[PDB]
Design a protein around this ligand. Structure first.
Ligand SMILES: NCCCC[C@H](NCc1cccc(-c2cccnc2)c1)C(N)=O
Ligand SMILES: NCCCC[C@H](NCc1cccc(-c2cccnc2)c1)C(N)=O
Length: 426
């Protein structure tokens, strides 16, 4: 009946003076916009159908045409930014918000999905969805004693849309909106469905992707222990945002970082730092680099949990971007650490992999490593053992790499190189 209509016929039906003809044509449009291979979204838009779809959203008396038009519109709004804008410009946002409280679950759910795609397009549309009042009725759909009584797909949909209201930057979402959403987020974060957990984790990672005040309003809700638990999950779609969130949180204050350690995060890092997924290992090392930039007592906890050999491991062998993060973790450790902590680092074998990376055609990691070497000598000076350190560096071929850096493009590299040589190598 409604399979593979032409746009011309859809237009004829929607323009008819007959609600049933309009319904049948709207369903035809929905199916056309749903096809996997290149759905003719721009042709539907050019045909002027968006405002007609939007007017159908208001037909309380005909719930099937509300549903079909909602679905058609959602198909369009899930496209490019220009296509999402066409839907918003047709007046769809308040129409969809009014549909959240529909008695028909299928329709409500379609409106949830539409608003998530609109909000997800960017900061301005996100904020516009919020200004039209979407948050209260969305939260109201989750106001049941036990989330398990809700249909799984319905709950995943709501969680995903809430995560889009948390998502973008410049600006970040309104503080007021974040505080309104966060308690429901915390509740979703302990719900036993992997997709809900993943999307809740993503939402938390967005909210913590900012200044310390933003991190604080999340941490104050007490979610860090649950994040650390999820960090240990077997499902990669859960571990990835949980680690992103934890990583964001330790870019904050010493106290915020301490909550992460206190919750037992460091015990997961032997696995994370050797994870077969490259981006997990990269993000875990980044996280370590922010922890070693903390207090000496926090560095000591990294030591105590046996993580220094793992950092030596990543420095020794890893995707290059991961090795760069490891170099940062080592520079931060040596800038901030006690003499005894720095000695321990050398006893763990940091020198050879550090020196091997001076071969890297990448100016930034080089300065970073030279910085680390300078820091280690400084600790050695306080023990009167630069000579022993110099021999070490000399034996693994480090002197040759530093001397080769004499004749190198960069001024910081040059200067730092020659300084090290004349100061510690005859
Ligand atoms: N002074 C501005 C800040 C300088 C320090 C720092 N550079 C951050 C930075 C640089 C390069 C890479 C990352 C990174 C990589 C992988 C995962 N996660 C992150 C992070 C930052 N916090 O922006
Ligand atoms: N005062 C504490 C916060 C700043 C710490 C300070 N700045 C550098 C710093 C701290 C933490 C992480 C990074 C970093 C840079 C690039 C890539 N990945 C990670 C850099 C330092 N040298 O310890």
């Amino acid at each position: 009946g409604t399979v593979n209509w032409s746009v011309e016929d859809i237009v004829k039906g929607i323009n008819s003076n007959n609600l049933e003809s309009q319904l049948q044509a709207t369903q035809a449009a929905r199916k056309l916009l749903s096809r996997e291979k290149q759905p003719p979204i721009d042709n539907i838009i050019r045909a002027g159908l968006i405002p007609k779809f939007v007017s159908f959203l208001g037909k309380t008396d005909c719930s099937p045409i509300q549903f079909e038009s909602a679905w058609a519109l959602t198909n369009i709004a899930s496209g490019t930014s220009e296509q999402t804008k066409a839907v918003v410009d047709g007046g769809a946002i308040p129409a969809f918000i009014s549909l959240l409280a529909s008695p028909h679950a299928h329709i409500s759910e379609q409106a949830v999905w539409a608003l998530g795609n609109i909000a997800g397009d960017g900061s301005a549309f996100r904020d516009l969805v919020i200004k039209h009042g979407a948050i209260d009725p969305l939260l109201a759909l989750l106001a049941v004693p036990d989330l398990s009584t809700l249909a799984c797909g319905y709950l995943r949909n709501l969680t995903w849309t809430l995560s889009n209201l948390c998502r973008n930057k410049n600006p970040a979402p309104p503080l007021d909106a974040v505080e309104q959403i966060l308690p429901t987020l915390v509740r979703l974060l302990h719900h036993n469905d992997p997709e809900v957990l993943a999307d809740s984790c993503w939402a938390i990672s967005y909210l913590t992707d900012g200044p310390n005040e933003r991190i604080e309003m999340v941490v104050k809700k007490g979610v860090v222990p649950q994040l650390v638990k999820l960090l240990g999950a077997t499902e990669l779609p859960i571990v990835t945002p949980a680690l992103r969130a934890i990583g964001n949180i330790v870019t904050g204050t010493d106290e915020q970082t301490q909550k992460v350690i206190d919750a037992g995060a460091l015990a997961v890092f032997p696995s994370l730092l050797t994870n077969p997924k490259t981006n997990i290992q990269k993000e875990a090392t980044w996280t370590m680099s922010n922890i070693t930039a903390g207090r000496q007592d926090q560095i000591q906890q990294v030591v105590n949990h046996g993580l220094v050999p793992f950092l030596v491991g990543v420095l020794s062998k890893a995707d290059f971007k991961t090795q760069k993060e490891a170099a940062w973790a080592i520079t931060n450790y040596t800038s901030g650490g006690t003499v005894e902590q720095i000695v321990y680092l050398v006893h763990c074998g940091i020198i050879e992999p550090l020196m091997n990376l001076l071969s890297a055609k990448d100016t930034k990691i080089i300065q970073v490593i030279l910085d680390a070497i300078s820091n280690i000598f400084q600790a050695a000076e306080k023990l009167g053992e630069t000579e022993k350190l110099s021999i070490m560096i000399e034996e693994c071929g480090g002197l040759d790499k530093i001397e080769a850096l004499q004749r190198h493009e960069n001024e910081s590299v040059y200067k730092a190189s020659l300084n090290l040589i004349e100061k510690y190598f005859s």
